[PDB]
Structures are given as C-alpha cells and as structure tokens.
Amino acid sequence: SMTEIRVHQGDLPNLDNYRIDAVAVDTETLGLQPHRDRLCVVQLSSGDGTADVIQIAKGQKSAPNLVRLLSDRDITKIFHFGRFDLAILAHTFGVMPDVVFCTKIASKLTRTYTDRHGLKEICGELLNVNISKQQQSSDWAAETLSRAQIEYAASDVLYLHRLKDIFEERLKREERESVAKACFQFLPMRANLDLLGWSEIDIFAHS
Amino acid sequence: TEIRVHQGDLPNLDNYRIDAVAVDTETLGLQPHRDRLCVVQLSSGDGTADVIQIAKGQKSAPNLVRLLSDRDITKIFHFGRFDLAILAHTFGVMPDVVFCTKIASKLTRTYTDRHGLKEICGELLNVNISKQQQSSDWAAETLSRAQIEYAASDVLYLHRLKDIFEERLKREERESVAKACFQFLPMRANLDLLGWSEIDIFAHS
Amino acid sequence: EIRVHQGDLPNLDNYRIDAVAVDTETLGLQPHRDRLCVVQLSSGDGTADVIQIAKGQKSAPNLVRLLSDRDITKIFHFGRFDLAILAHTFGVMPDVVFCTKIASKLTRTYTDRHGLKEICGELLNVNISKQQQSSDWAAETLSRAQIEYAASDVLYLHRLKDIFEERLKREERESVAKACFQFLPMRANLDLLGWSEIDIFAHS
Amino acid sequence: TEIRVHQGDLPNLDNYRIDAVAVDTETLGLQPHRDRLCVVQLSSGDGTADVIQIAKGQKSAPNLVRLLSDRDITKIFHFGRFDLAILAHTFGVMPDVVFCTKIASKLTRTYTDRHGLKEICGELLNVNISKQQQSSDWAAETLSRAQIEYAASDVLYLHRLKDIFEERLKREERESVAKACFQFLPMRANLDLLGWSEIDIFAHS
Amino acid sequence: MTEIRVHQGDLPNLDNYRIDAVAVDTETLGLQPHRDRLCVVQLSSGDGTADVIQIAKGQKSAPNLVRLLSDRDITKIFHFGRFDLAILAHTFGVMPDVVFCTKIASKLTRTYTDRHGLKEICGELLNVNISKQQQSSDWAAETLSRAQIEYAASDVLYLHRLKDIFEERLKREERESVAKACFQFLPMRANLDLLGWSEIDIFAHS
Amino acid sequence: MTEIRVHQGDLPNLDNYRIDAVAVDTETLGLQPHRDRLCVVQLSSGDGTADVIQIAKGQKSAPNLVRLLSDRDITKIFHFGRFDLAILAHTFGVMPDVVFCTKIASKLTRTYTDRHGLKEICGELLNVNISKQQQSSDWAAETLSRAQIEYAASDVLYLHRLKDIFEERLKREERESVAKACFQFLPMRANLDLLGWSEIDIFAHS
Amino acid sequence: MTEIRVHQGDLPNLDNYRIDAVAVDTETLGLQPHRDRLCVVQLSSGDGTADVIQIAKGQKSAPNLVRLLSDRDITKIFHFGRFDLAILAHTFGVMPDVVFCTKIASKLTRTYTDRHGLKEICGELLNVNISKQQQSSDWAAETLSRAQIEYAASDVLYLHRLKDIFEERLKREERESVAKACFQFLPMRANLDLLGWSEIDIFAHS
Amino acid sequence: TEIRVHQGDLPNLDNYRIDAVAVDTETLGLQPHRDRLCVVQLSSGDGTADVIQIAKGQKSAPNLVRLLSDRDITKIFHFGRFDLAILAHTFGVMPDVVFCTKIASKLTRTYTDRHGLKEICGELLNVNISKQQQSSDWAAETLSRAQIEYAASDVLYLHRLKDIFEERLKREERESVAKACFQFLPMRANLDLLGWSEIDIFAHS
Ligand SMILES: Nc1ncnc2c1ncn2[C@@H]1O[C@H](COP(=O)(O)O)[C@@H](OP(=O)(O)O)[C@H]1O
Ligand SMILES: Nc1ncnc2c1ncn2[C@@H]1O[C@H](COP(=O)(O)O)[C@@H](OP(=O)(O)O)[C@H]1O
Ligand SMILES: Nc1ncnc2c1ncn2[C@@H]1O[C@H](COP(=O)(O)O)[C@@H](OP(=O)(O)O)[C@H]1O
Ligand SMILES: Nc1ncnc2c1ncn2[C@@H]1O[C@H](COP(=O)(O)O)[C@@H](OP(=O)(O)O)[C@H]1O
Ligand SMILES: Nc1ncnc2c1ncn2[C@@H]1O[C@H](COP(=O)(O)O)[C@@H](OP(=O)(O)O)[C@H]1O
Ligand SMILES: Nc1ncnc2c1ncn2[C@@H]1O[C@H](COP(=O)(O)O)[C@@H](OP(=O)(O)O)[C@H]1O
C-alpha cells in the first residue's frame, strides 16, 4: 500500500534503498513509440515490498541517481518486457542498461504450456497475486498522479524479484540457463534496434 | 571456377589456411530433427568451391569440423541461422565466430524487403544465381552437375558480399549492431533446435 | 433536461455561444441510402436539443444558421460522418469544427480505443450506454431511451474539448489538430463523392 | 537526355525561373529518422533534369531550399507525402505550394487501383519507366549511369502529367477537392514525421 | 405457460392452420442437408401457440405439413428461410414458393446494424429474449427435453409479429418490390445450395 | 478487318437490330455508378460487327438504344450484366428485364474452374484471344483511340456464340430453370446495388 | 470429493484395471514432445475414481502402465488421443493400437457444432462442468496441488460415459465403421507427428 | 504415343494382366454429388494408355470395376483421395489396394511444398506435363486430341514415379508410414462422400 510507496519528482534523492545486487524496474509513458511518447514515470523496487515511483518531467534528460543504478554493472536490472523499458530509458537518458533479466523472455523459455506471458497471468500462476491492469490506459503525463495510478505503477515492480527467483529455478530445472543468459545479453541491442528503426522487424527471420 | 566434390570430409585443410570461410548446407528439408544434412559447401573466396557429400547417419567430419570450431576463422553464411542449426545438430559443434549476409543485408539494404541471396548477388555483384536445383534430392548418392554447380554458387560469392556489407555497416555506423546480432546467432540457432523455431523470443506476443 | 423538436429548433435563443456540440442519428452509415433522422445539439450547459428530421426534409433554417455561422465552432465526435450527412441533407457544409475523435487520436497515444464511450469513461468518469445505437431512429415517436441516448452524445462534448485542448497544448500539437479540423469538411465531401473507402493520402 | 549532376546543391537558379518545378528524392529507405536523404531530383519540364547528391550529415542546400520555399512556384511531386517529409526533416523547410500526381491519379483515374508513376506514365504518355534501379545504393559516392537515368526519369514527366490531370480534374469538377488535398499534404507529411505515419488520422478506427 | 403441441411425424390435421400465413422453422443434426437429417419442423399460426413435429430418420412424407408448405394461398414465414427451404425440399421433395424471410427483411430495413440474427431482432423489435442455449443439442433424440421444445417453439412464436413490423418498414422505405423479388428468388437460392452451390454467391463477379 | 461503327449519343436507327437477341456491354469511368458516368455503350447483332456508342457527360436519354433495352421480345446478352444493368438503369432510367448473362451461365456450367472472366471463357470456348490492355483507359475521352474502340467491340462480338454454347450446356446438365431464375432476379440484384447493397450478398446468413 | 490415488512413477499394480477399457490422459510441459516432457499420466477404470501418476524427468519405463497400453484386449479411451499417443510412445517406446477417441467421435456425431473440446462435450452430454484453470500450470512440479490433481483426474473420470453415448450415436447414424477406421489410423497419425509432420494434414491436396 | 479411346468400358483386360495399374479420372468438377464422372484413364506402365469416356447416367463398367476390385492389383493414383471418391460414388466399388504419388511425395519430397503431378514429373523424370486442358469440357461427346493427350499424360508416368517414391520411402525408412496412409485413403475418400470433405478428421480444431 501507500505506506510502502515513495513518490519522487525527477530522480531518487539517493541510493540508500538500492545498495543491492538486483533492482526491479518499470516505466510509464504516453505510449509505445519512444520518439513520440515521452517517458513519464520510472518505478523501482529493491524486492523488500516497497517501491519508488519517480515522475519524469517533459524535456528531462538526466536523473543521475536512477541512471547510476541503470549503469551499475554489479546490479541486475529486472524488467517484465525489458525490450520496451530499455528503449525508452536509453532514449530518454542516453544510457542503455546492459545487465538485465526479463520475466517475459524467462516465461517464454519456461512456461512452454501456454501462450499467455503477460505479467498479470504470470503473477497469478506463479504467486497467486492479483494484478489489475485498469490504470494502464491513463494519462501518465499528469502533473499529479492519482492514488490508483501510483499503486498500479508500484505493483508492476513489487513482484519481479520473486518471479525472477522462480524462473531461475525453472531455467535450471529445464537446463536452459545459458539460453536465457544469451537472450538477456542481446536484449539491450534488440532495444537499440527498435530505437534505430527496426522495431517492426525480427532481425533473425528469414523474411 | 573449380568445384571439388568430396565424400564425407575434406581430404585436408590445404586450401583453408585462411581467416574467413564461406559455408552453406543442403539437406532433405528445413526440419533438422527429420531432414538430414546432405551436403556442406565451402569456399576460401578464391573462386573455387568444395562440395562435401555427407552420408546418412554421419556425425563426424574432422577436417570440416576443425574449421567450424576454429575461433580464428570467421564462418560466412547466408542465413546462418539455419546452417548453424543443422551443423550443430549433425556434428555436435556450434560455430561461434560468424558473419551472416542476410542479417547484414537487413541492416544495410534498408530500401528493400528482398534479402535473398539471388537478389543480393544480382544487385551488389551483377551475378545471376539460379534457384532451380534448390528443390532437388540432395540425398542422392550421386549429385547432378546442376546440383553441384548450384551448391557451389551458394558459397562462391559470400566473401565479396561480406566485404561490401562491411563497408556499408561502417558507412552507416552499424558495426556494433551487426556484431551483436552475429554473436547471438548461434543461440538463435540453438533455440530453433530446442523447439522455439517458430517463436520470435523477443516479441511481446 | 432534453428538448425534443419536430423539424428544426424553434429559435436560436439557447445558442448565442462560441461553440455548439452536434451529433446526428440516421438509418445507417450510407448517406445516399440512409436518411438523416435526428440532429442533436447542446450549448454545454448540461441540456440538449433533440430535433427529429422528417423523411424528405430539405431545410432546417435555424439549425443551418448555426452550422453556417463561422463564429461558432461545431464540436463533433467523429464529425467526418456527421458533416457528410448534414451537408448531404441540408446542402451546407460546416467549416469551423472540432472533432473529439481526431483530438483523441492526437493525444490519447496510449490506447487504440477512441470511441466516445471510452473517452467519456476515462476523461469524465461518465458512463455512456450504447444500447439504443441500434434502434429505429426513423420512428415517428422516439422512445425515452432513444432520446436519452441521442442527448448523451452531445451533453459532454464541450467538457471533452476543453480537456483535449489542454492536452493538445501540453504536447504542442495545436497546429496539427487545427489543420486536421480544417481538412475534415473536405474529407466528408470526399466520402459523399465516392471515396468513403479510400484513404486519399495512402500510397496504395 | 541531358542530366546535370551536382554535389550538394544547384550551382544557381538559372534553369528554375519558372512557375512550377518537378521534384523527387532518393533515400536509403522509407524511414526518414533512419534513412538519410541521398539525392534530390529537379526538372523544369524542358526535357532535362538536375540530379543533386546530398552528403551524409548535410544540413543545408540554399538554392534548392529557395525553390522549396518560393510560394510562387508549385512543387510537383509523385507521392509528395514522402518527399515533403524527408525534405522538411533534412533541411527544415516544408513546401506549402504543391501538386501531387498520385493524389491527382486517385481523384481522376477512378477505373483502376494502379496509381504508381510507371503505370501513370505508360497510360497517359506512352512512356516506359524502368524500376530496376529503385532498389540500389542511393548513398553511393558515385551514382551509376543507370541510377542517374532512373532518378531523372522520376521528374522528366511530372509537368506533362500535371497538365493532363488538371484537365481531368476540371472535366470531372474535382479541382477544389484536389486543392484541399494538396493543401493538407504538408501536414500529412508532418504527421508522419511526428509519429503517425501508420495512422489514417481521419479513420473511425 | 406457452402451449406447445408435440407431434410424431406429421400434424394430425390442419385445424389450427386455416390461416393466410404460417411461421416455419426446422431443427436438424447440422447444416449440411445431404449428411444431416431433418429432425424437427416447428409451426405457429401466430396465436401464441406452436406445433413441434418430430421427423423420424428416413421419413420421406408428412402429408399435412407438406400441404401447408405447398398451399400457394398460405405465406410461409421463416427466419433465414434459405436453409429451411433447402432441408424441407430435400426431405419431402416439395419446395415452398410463397415465402417471407425475416432475415432478408431485416437486411433490407435494419440498415443501421450488421446483427440480423433472430435473437437480436426479437430483442430490438419486440423486447423478447430468445435463449440460444439449446441450438447446439441432439435434435435427433427420441424424446426432446422441455428446454429443446421451448427453444424450438420460440423460433416460430414471434415471426408473424416480426413480419408485420418489417412490412411497415419496407413500405416506409419504399422497398416492398425489392423484398418481394428477393423472396421470389429465395427457393431457387435454396435449390442452388442443394445442387452444389451452397458456398457460392451466384451473383458475384468473383 | 472487323466492322465497328462508332456513334455519338445514340444509334442512328435500329436497322441492324431487328433481331431477337442483342449483345450489350458498357464502359464507364469506374465501378461506382453514382460517381463514375456511363461513357460507352457497345452493341452487336452477332454478325461479326459492332456498334460503339459514346455517351456524353450528363446524357440521360438515347431513344434508339433505350427502345432495344426496353423491348421485351429482344434478349439482352451481357457478360456480368449485374454491372451493366445498374449503370444503364441509373443513366437512362430503364431497367432491361429480358437478359442472359454469360458470367452467371459460366458459373452454372463451367463447374471445373473458378476463372469466369470473359477472356478466359472466350479462349476456352471459342479459341478467341481477348486483350485486356485497354480496360484501364480514359473511357470519357472525347475521341476514343482505335485500340479502345477495338477493345470495346471485342466485349460484344462473341456473346451470341457464347450464349449458344452455354445454352447447350445448361440443357445438357439440366439447369435451364436455375439459369432462368438467376437471370430473372438479375435486374433486382442490379437495383439492390444502386440502392446501396452493392457490397452485400442479400442471401447470405451473415 | 472424488477418490484420487496419486502415484510416483507407475501404478503399484493392475488390480483396479482388470477391465475391457481404460480411460487415459497425460499432462506435459507443453505440446512439443521433443522438448516438453511427460509429467503425469491419468487413468480411470470408469468407477468414478482415478489414478494420477507423476512421471519423473528422464523416466523411461513404467511397467504396469505400459502393460495396459500394450494390452490388445483393453481399449484405451482418450480425448484427443492423437497427442496422448505421441507423448506416450515417445516417452515409453510403446504405441497403443486399440483406442477410442472422444474428439474424433464428437466430430463424427456432433455435426451441429464446431466445439469439440472436452469441457463442451462434458457439459452437453453429461451436464458435467470441467474447469480448465489448472491446464496452464507447472505439471512438472515435484508436488502437484490439489487443484492440479482434481483437474488431471477430471480428464479421465468421464470418458467411459462419453464413449457409451458416442457409440450410441455412431450406431444411430451408421458411422461405426468410419469411426473404427479413424481409430485404427490414429496411432500412425501420432507417429507422423513424432516424425515431423505434426503441422501437415497428410491427406490434403495442398 | 498410343492412346486407345473407349466408350463406356475397356473391351477386355488383355492389356491389364499386371500387378499394378495407373488410374486417373476426369469430371465436370470437384463435387462428386454434382459433377459426374466423365473419363477414366488407365495405363499398364508400358508407355500407352486407355481413355474411357463414361456416359451421363452410366452406372456400370464391368472390366474397369474388375480391375478396381482386384486385390492382386495395386491401383496407382496421383491424389487418389479424389479419384477413389468419384469412382466409388459412380460404380459402387471402393478400391482398397492403392498407392498415391501425392501422399508419397509429401512423405519424401520434404524439401518443397510443391506436390502437384506436373512438378513431380518435371523433377523426378524431366517430363513436362501441360495443364492447359485441365479446364475443359470433359463431358464433351468427342474429346479433342489435346484433351485425350492430357488425360493420357496423367497415367503414363505413375508407375515410374511409384518406383522412385518406393526407393525414397525405403531410403528414409518410411514404408510402414506410407502403407498406413494408403490403407486409410479409401476411408478418407468415404469421409469426403459422407460430408466431411472440408474437415481434417484428425485435427484438434
Ligand atoms: N509492444 C507492446 N505490446 C504490448 N505491451 C507493451 C508493448 N510494449 C510495451 N508494452 C508495455 O510493457 C508491458 C507489457 O506487459 P505484458 O506482457 O503484461 O502485456 C506493459 O507495461 P506495464 O507493465 O508498465 O503496464 C505494456 O504497456
Ligand atoms: N525458413 C527458411 N526459409 C527459407 N529458406 C530457408 C529457410 N531455412 C533455411 N533456408 C535455406 O537458407 C537459404 C535461404 O536463402 P535465401 O535468403 O536466398 O532465401 C536457402 O538455402 P540455399 O542457399 O542453400 O539454397 C534455404 O533453402
Ligand atoms: N464508419 C463508422 N464506423 C463506426 N461508427 C460510425 C461510422 N460512421 C459513423 N459512425 C457513427 O459515428 C459515431 C462513432 O462513434 P464512436 O467513435 O464512439 O464509435 C457513432 O455515432 P453516435 O455517437 O451518434 O452513436 C456511429 O454510429
Ligand atoms: N510508403 C511507400 N510505399 C511505396 N513507395 C514509397 C513509399 N514511400 C515513398 N515511396 C517512394 O515514392 C515513390 C512512389 O512511387 P509509386 O507510386 O510509383 O510506387 C517511389 O519513389 P521513386 O519514384 O523515387 O522511386 C517510392 O520509393
Ligand atoms: N449457414 C448458417 N449459418 C448460421 N446459421 C444457420 C446457417 N444455416 C442454417 N442456420 C440455422 O438458421 C438459423 C439462423 O438464425 P440466426 O440468423 O438467428 O443466426 C438458425 O436456426 P434456428 O433459429 O432454428 O436455431 C441456424 O441454426
Ligand atoms: N465488381 C467488378 N469486378 C470486376 N469487374 C467488374 C466489376 N464490375 C463491373 N466490372 C466490369 O464487368 C466486366 C467483368 O468482366 P470479367 O468477368 O471478364 O472480369 C468488365 O467489364 P468489360 O468487359 O467491359 O471490361 C469489368 O470492367
């Protein structure tokens, strides 16, 4: 709840809550096209049940404490569908995180019995946790976010550590750890390809 | 042009003391778990090619495999995603120093959606590739002259294409992008073998 | 409060305003086959006028006066259709318009749902019921549910336009929007002339 | 066929003291944010053409931009939606006096869905445009003769096409419709550059 | 509380059908007349009652029903008569030729929608709810359930009232002669289906 | 070597058309009758000659042509008459109602193919090559080119011969009454197109 | 609460399976047998109880289970046996060849619908509600949840009753020999899938 | 090329004292309940063929039906699924000893999706089949020479194709698979006649 959500303008005040080896990251934007739709919110969690919700201003190009986390190679950044978050973060702040774990890719490599790899479905199946998608289609650029917006934004990062632990168990069980690591290693370049103009192209397809 | 046809393996590596080798395969089809490797083609880029027939059930070819495993030799493919899969499935070795002219074309020939080898050879080299023998019995005990010449044609021009694509990648400042794609390409081939050949592992849905 | 009229507004006493919300109801989406049945208006004050248009009716002077008045912005949701049927029926094409569908497509970039019900729910927390959309709009006597539906289509457009204007300004798209609104009458004319299925600007 | 080839810009406007100029562009692809402007072609309609090679990183072209900004000169394009976008993106100036033969074709050649320049030139003028060089490296330091002839053919006939389409627009009483379309075209190109290139802004859904 | 008379094979007589128009529907084992037999024929005079006639496997005759179907003084009202006409003609060898179809009528009058199903039409025109739950059931069963019997009856209980409304709309929009021509071709459209053209719009360019 | 008489406005008289069936085709500015005007009407008596009639912008009458179109003792033969009937009725205010359509006949007889265009039918049944190059041309041109005129004539030169062969096949496969009912509805199918149903198969379930 | 016996590796014995027909289903990590391992085999004698057998990663034999699968005197009942047969033969090396499939049976008899899933069939023929919630779950888990165990049992608890009804319908519609032939080919259809034709209808023209 | 044309039936079985017979049909179309059987073609594989015109309403063809019922004679088809249906529909006898070159192609030519008789004849035999007469009036009282040659060409090569496919089925160890497909083929044809022609009975959905 709000007792464990901290809301910031522009950047984290410091990294006191992020002296950790992995951080859960998500974004909210005005849409899915980074060259048109600005970054509006960045959400973080340490995995301790709290979240930081950082409002990004129009035209903002810097956030040194957040960007230090994104650049710190000793901290794994956990995303759900990091392909998008990596693109908007690199586009906005000029830094592409390069140590990452993605729960969507992990799901596609382990939940081979379904085609539903969205966060809501994964949190339901793996954690019995209910995620509401209601605030996803809202004005994330508003000067003041609603309480429902803040709690929705925070819920997208509160569970990614636990999902990562379970997916790592499954990847070990099915002997796919090196496959997953190679996908994660390429994911920042997949994001770059999107920013450069190949967002509709599977670069590995025959045609 | 000279085309040397071999059974099982190269006799030696005397023509392949080189830094990059052009490689293609022919099979009974596109499903490596069903369709066996039938031919491996090589060229040093000198205008000659080696066409190696692979027997049913064959799982070794020491001279060929030495080249495929040699980290100091770049293996040049057109659509290496497939060739890497069938080579690793057959011989147990996954090359990890590669250049793929299809990926290179997709990163440089941004004005077209035609990234096949025939189209690329015609545009960049004014070389005409015939596709007629693509649909043939590559498992035949004796290949026809047309099969042999088609198989050789798939590797005779890859060095020249690689040089041009490298120029374009530099010109448009996409060298690090291409290198990352080539670095992931063996794992993309691995994903295909393990059961994800119909899945873009990076797509949202 | 909904005021129901036969044929035309009795007068323009309620419409000495800078902008008027407009919608239509018809027998379907093909102006050459499907007649104009209803024109709805609102001044923005939470009341509406619902004008039943008779089969074969060729004029409505008070309504056409508003539609032709260049000092009054006509607000539509998907004006592309309303402009076509109004011009086809009464012979006058409005040329000072604001369309909340176009404005939504220029500002609600986070969704592909640009219908009026979705927009009212999101921006106003107003629930639009679509149940009476598929009904006999040519009926001699409209049902209360029809009348309330038709009015609901115009009662909120002023409030939507104010919000969309703020977003257009925030994202610096005011002049893009203005140009789209400027072309919308000719887009409607293109539909009437036989290009309704053609994006005239597409390559193919 | 006299084709004058320039680096960067026209040397002067001596050939373009005219009321309408035919304009085309060649690029590395259809995405202006990725694919740079490589060539601008111009014709006064006298049977000659100017082919201007645009350098990578080139930000200005004062003589060409003078024509593009001159409100007394109609810029004639075939599918100006694209040309307007890449020119405005590259040099910062959006022409606002335009005629587009693709829009004119769609408003007059109502008996067909084939509105490409090759089709239009064949039907209206019995002139055969070859499309072979369309897929080529338009960023090459030296364009080939075939490339230069292709680039010129894109502009050599637009004046003649414009005259015929104007007659058909008059005959079918669609002049004001065409004029409104041409007037919105720069904003349609702007919409593309801003991120709506895949969206018919006027569609219901 | 709807009175539904269930019969084996045929109506016992035509006492309830000395009328100018009869509502007709069928139930079958599926939509392919050469494979899927006619199982049920439903009739209503429009008086709020219905007759539900179970057709046996291999049954080729039902003289009282077939008299109604052949009587040119009686308009047969269907919803999507294209199918019912086909299965009735295939089974009994008689093609009704005086018909009214509420689906065609809807397509010519409810121009503001693409939803021309009976359930949607009954809801809009009459504020009557049709349940579709029993549509996919074993219509060949020796004993139909009450749910099946009520479903079969609901298909015919409202066609007279629908026809009256559609006739008013056809007159208002001046489409009576258009509809009449469509109804007159409908038996031949059904015949075309039986002959092998069921997947072909015979009037299409391609 | 083929006699093609070109007229402006109308036939000068009916001297060449004291016959029991006439082949008819149209050319227009496109497939939308409300936007795309009738530009040409072509006729042939079946004697290897053709009349090509240019129709002016806004022209609404053509008394000799319309006498033929209205004459119930003269069958009008079309290929895809569905369209020709629509534009002719739209322009001249008369709907021909004694018609034969070689496209419908082909669909009812050439059951082994889905290629029912005039070029394919002429090649298969007559070994006659029809060129389509001039189909996409400006049929409103004040002066038609020789190639346009020959194309327009070729659309009507062979319809009698096609009709005779299709009538043999309809007889052989016993589909004459089916074809006749299709031809009888075709004017109303054209009317439906003009009234706003040109994209709707009025007989489809959905 | 249903009696469900949960086993590790194999049935302890065949004492509950001295019967003429056994209901069989499987659970796996997915639909690709060369990637997705067999995790569970479920059995029912038809007495309202089930056996749920957890199959370990890398397990290559299950002697009692395979005895049933290879017993030509015991009909193996599946719903969509095409998949179960493939994963069973791939895992244990034995292809059952005396089978009945309720999915094929449904396609041959429930001709009035295109919904041939187990849930829809159980709802219609038995008024039994199958929940599909646990279908997407980690079937490889060391400890299956009670929800998983009940779901896995529900897939075999009703197949005897369905088979009885479908045999009645196949007889009513005179399709017993067609159905038998389909069941006899089903093992080879599963083999074709394992060999690389899982996406190919081997009998299609193209 | 000797083609013997008969009315109704073979005059005798003198040319068919053989272990395998090549069979094809021609019809008025693909719907056996509407489109009658018009022609039945036979070849012993000796490079000659018999073309049997079947009359409208003909219910009997005793010599042909003797061959179709003879369990000592394999009936070779290309796409026997259809021919089996129209033959059983017309004469009441379903052959149950069959070989189908289309099924055999799908089981062996795994490198292509082109399994038509023309493609197969060109690849395996270098024989060119013309499809021109396929769309013709097969019900004509007098077939043209081109029709008769087309119908003969459909059976003249099936023995030679069967031999090659039998070699490939052996090579790839798929003989039992093919045999089971051929043994279900009559029931697949029966399924089509009973009303399942648009349904893959084995599909999940
Ligand atoms: N191409 C895409 N398709 C769908 N969602 C996308 C997307 N690109 C980015 N997203 C966003 O990335 C996340 C996808 O999550 P999911 O897999 O559950 O659909 C969502 O963000 P949020 O989680 O911040 O709402 C979604 O809005
Ligand atoms: N999914 C696929 N689609 C098309 N070709 C594929 C393929 N997988 C492998 N290939 C083969 O990889 C090469 C693709 O080449 P291209 O891009 O020109 O189509 C071809 O081999 P060959 O070059 O040996 O004929 C082709 O047979
Ligand atoms: N091509 C079209 N598609 C859908 N609705 C259309 C339409 N053309 C006109 N309309 C009508 O214009 C409005 C579109 O609204 P929306 O964007 O919410 O779907 C609706 O009118 P009403 O608001 O009067 O019902 C609808 O009936
Ligand atoms: N979305 C698009 N689709 C197709 N062609 C496009 C295009 N955008 C720009 N073009 C280019 O605009 C012109 C379209 O021409 P056409 O209508 O004849 O197809 C071509 O340029 P060029 O004429 O310089 O080759 C084409 O390369
Ligand atoms: N091609 C078809 N598509 C859908 N329904 C069809 C059909 N052919 C026949 N029917 C049946 O005709 C009626 C269609 O009605 P509707 O338009 O409301 O969908 C239904 O019968 P019932 O009304 O007896 O259930 C339906 O089962
Ligand atoms: N919807 C449509 N689709 C295709 N052709 C159409 C058509 N409507 C009218 N036509 C015209 O009707 C005729 C159909 O011919 P076909 O069956 O050979 O394609 C052609 O005329 P013309 O013969 O005068 O060129 C064609 O131009």
Ligand SMILES: Nc1ncnc2c1ncn2[C@@H]1O[C@H](COP(=O)(O)O)[C@@H](OP(=O)(O)O)[C@H]1O
């Ligand atoms: N291609 C496929 N499509 C859908 N389900 C498939 C399938 N292959 C195997 N299955 C499985 O076979 C059964 C199909 O059931 P249905 O016909 O009701 O959809 C399901 O198993 P379970 O019954 O054990 O869940 C499903 O998981």
Ligand SMILES: Nc1ncnc2c1ncn2[C@@H]1O[C@H](COP(=O)(O)O)[C@@H](OP(=O)(O)O)[C@H]1O
């Ligand atoms: N569903 C179908 N699709 C295509 N052809 C079919 C068919 N059913 C039957 N046929 C006929 O079966 C043969 C298929 O051949 P192919 O595989 O080469 O396309 C052809 O006959 P003919 O060979 O006698 O002409 C074709 O006319």
